[PDB]
Amino acid sequence: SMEMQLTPFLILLRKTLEQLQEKDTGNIFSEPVPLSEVPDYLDHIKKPMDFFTMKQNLEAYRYLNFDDFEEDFNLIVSNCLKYNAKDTIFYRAAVRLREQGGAVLRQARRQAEKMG
Numbered sequence: 001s002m003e004m005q006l007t008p009f010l011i012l013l014r015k016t017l018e019q020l021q022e023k024d025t026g027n028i029f030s031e032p033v034p035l036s037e038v039p040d041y042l043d044h045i046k047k048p049m050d051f052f053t054m055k056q057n058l059e060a061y062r063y064l065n066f067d068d069f070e071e072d073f074n075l076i077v078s079n080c081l082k083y084n085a086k087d088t089i090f091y092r093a094a095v096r097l098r099e100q101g102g103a104v105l106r107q108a109r110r111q112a113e114k115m116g
């Protein structure tokens with residue numbers, strides 16, 4: 001909501017972001033894709049995203065509603081599916097992250113709705 005207390009909501013986002021990052025068992029989503037090793041990445045991906053950047057956005061108060069937070073998580077997944085071939089560790093890991101992050105987000109959204 002417009003008038004909900006922001007600090008409980010941001011603590012919820014911090015807890016949720018930690019739970020999502022814990023699903024990065026391949027350790028490929030928690031820092032920006034290294035452009036020095038993937039120099040054509042921005043030719044394909046318009047909005048890179050990763051869990052460190054999400055933490056920066058959170059602490060800069062760029063997430064004022066739950067949907068924008070979830071949209072950036074979804075970008076981590078969709079960027080990875082888009083850039084990488086299906087028969088890669090990266091692609092398979094993005095599918096796993098989509099599956100595991102979904103339950104985290106469903107529970108977190110229920111908590112966010114109770115704050116409005």
Ligand SMILES: Cc1nc(C)c(C(=O)Nc2nc(CN3C[C@H](C)C[C@H](C)C3)cs2)o1
Nearest residue numbers: 028029031032033034037038080083084090
């Ligand atoms: C989700 C995704 N899509 C793509 C195309 C990639 C990708 O190329 N990841 C890569 N990681 C590395 C190595 N990694 C090691 C860490 C310890 C630090 C961190 C900055 C770099 C090289 S390339 O990841």
